[model samples]
Target chain A: DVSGTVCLSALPPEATDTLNLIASDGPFPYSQDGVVFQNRESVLPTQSYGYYHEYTVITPGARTRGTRRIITGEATQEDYYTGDHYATFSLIDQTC
Target chain B: DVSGTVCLSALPPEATDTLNLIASDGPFPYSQDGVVFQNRESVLPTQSYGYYHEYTVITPGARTRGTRRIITGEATQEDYYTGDHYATFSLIDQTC
Candidate 1:
């Protein structure tokens, strides 16, 4: 686990729904939803390649996928949320 | 400026065209063009907010903007390229 501090309940309902899909090993809507996240900017703690995978978080009333997303670790236990594309992130605490 | 090793000449011609638009402060085609890049995934080096901006790289024959992008730094010197949306990135060396 990544030792996230932000409770999952605090996140938007759509985010929680996405988490469920991830848990079930998703039938994701977009083909690009379950791709590897390269972490090229090295924002999160350093890890080996393929340690992370990304999924989309739908933005209400927005065309396209919008900027919101959920990035989950290899074990899928630790997840991070980014509402503004890849610019910022908050670890998702699923214990809630 | 962040020292990057990739040469600009090696990039696709469309990427170079996008860079030119950035230099000239366009009249970009999409409304989303020239939007602030939040660096939400932390793939690049950490920098202050507003230090980066994103522009579209038109994929040949695609109706949409496609996943290709060019993210440039505040000084417009450092730029990053991604063909698969934000999944991966390579530093663009414009000096070439």
Candidate 2:
């Protein structure tokens, strides 16, 4: 499992919307919104191929989706974020 | 600055189509397709806020967009890919 934590409120407000969408089986905004994250560089703990997935975290004034993301595990509700693309990550604390 | 490289041809065939659309300023398939990528974590070289953008790299046999992505620089034609979301990246060697 990944280490560290960030509260839900600590994230961009858009991330909450994205998380809600995930919980509701989303009407996600992009085609690539709910795709499987390959985790090729192993930033998160090792898991099976299909064990993780990703979603977009909107940037306030961006014309595009932006690099911020939320990556979630399949068997666990635990999620992660990468503000600078995927170079670094922080576990998301859903408890607020 | 971020280092390493991967050839354009070595990437998924879908990436080529994404690149073409980027060049043509497309009728992209997704609403969030051409958004600015804020390098908040500073993974790539330091640059202006709007200096980079991102697009999806369709994953084969997947139900959604998948985690593969292509991030391109504004001042330069240079691009990068993260097949595993953003955990790691490889500069796209566009000269294929």
Candidate number with greatest TM-score: 2
lDDT tens readout by residue for model 2, A1-96:
245788989988898998999999889988888899988765675556778888998898899988999998875668898888887889888898
What does candidate 1 score on TM? 0.48
Candidate 2, residues B1-96, lDDT tens digits: the string is 455888999888878878898999886766678898887778878788888888887665565667898888975768888897776778988897
Estimated TM-score for each candidate:
0.48, 0.48
True contacts kept of each: 0.00, 0.00
Regions of candidate 1 where Cα sits further than 4 Å from its true position:
A1-96, B1-4
lDDT of 1 by residue, B7-78 (tens): 878878999899889889897878999888877665565456788889999999999989999988866478
Residue B72 deviation, candidate 1, in Å?
0.9
Model 2 chain B lDDT-worst window of ten? B57-66
